[PDB]
């Protein structure tokens, strides 16, 4: 084996699995998902004695059951339910990489409301709703609301988090440290507008979000990670196993 030496030993046989996923979305003003997909990778961190023969099993029939459009593996994976079999490198390594498009959990719903006031003001209300287990917290949430070029100033009211008008970037950035699943939040903003060439209207860019959630938006779940070492005297249940899910936004836009 060119990726793993042979005399490795550890008193504490332990492994760490990381399900990293980027969830991307393009949503219309009328709530239709124009486009959506997830890109994930499973990173394994393992400190196992010998030359262990592991079995990675996830919810792949295609309750809990998800479809994988495509995917790639680490050379150690022996290709041919039918699950992943390998003798992993020691330390950290990327076990697999995959994409998903079907039955994707969109962690956040963005509901925008814009109202024009003559030519001097824009009235914006943006509501964000978290679509996930209430015991789970989203972290690092950011809502980005674009403002027109002719913005002379911005007033915002937000009961949760902090928001800043960014002239330079032409946008209102609302930041929230954490937010529990199944919740609602809103931001109100009054955009003060300068005179402008009447003829050219404003092409309103989408409202975009940044967030990090503790579950895989694709719905993927680790079932088991079976360790077998025929020579050495530790069995699968001697192994200490941990899994973590870090789902993060990729492109996540809401057309207003």
């Amino acid at each position: 084996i060119g990726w793993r030496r042979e005399g490795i030993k550890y008193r504490r046989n332990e492994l760490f699995l990381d399900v990293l996923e980027s969830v991307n979305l393009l949503m219309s003003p009328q709530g239709q998902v124009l486009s959506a997909h997830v890109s994930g990778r499973v990173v394994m961190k393992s400190y196992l004695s010998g030359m262990p023969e592991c079995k990675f099993g996830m919810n792949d029939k295609i309750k809990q059951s998800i479809a994988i459009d495509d995917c790639t593996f680490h050379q150690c994976v022996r290709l041919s339910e039918r699950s992943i079999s390998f003798i992993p490198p020691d330390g950290e390594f990327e076990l697999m990489r995959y994409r998903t498009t079907k039955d994707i959990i969109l962690p956040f719903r963005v509901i925008p409301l814009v109202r024009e006031v003559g030519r001097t003001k824009l009235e914006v209300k943006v509501v964000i709703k978290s679509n996930f287990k209430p015991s789970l917290l989203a972290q690092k949430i950011e809502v980005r609301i674009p403002t027109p070029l002719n913005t002379s100033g911005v007033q915002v009211i937000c009961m949760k988090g902090k928001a800043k008008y960014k002239a330079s970037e032409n946008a209102i950035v609302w930041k929230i440290k954490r937010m529990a699943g199944m919740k609602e939040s809103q931001i109100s903003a009054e955009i003060e507008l300068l005179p402008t060439n009447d003829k050219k209207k404003w092409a309103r860019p989408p409202i975009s979000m940044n967030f990090e959630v503790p579950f895989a938006p694709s719905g993927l779940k680790v079932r088991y990670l079976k360790v077998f070492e025929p020579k050495l005297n530790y069995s699968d249940h001697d192994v200490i196993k941990w899994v973590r899910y870090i789902g993060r936004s990729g492109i996540y836009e809401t057309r207003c």
Binding site: L17, V222, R223, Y224, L225, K241, W242, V243, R244
Partner: peptide, 6 residues
Amino acid sequence: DYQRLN
């Protein structure tokens, strides 16, 4: 965060 696998 990390959770014990089954």
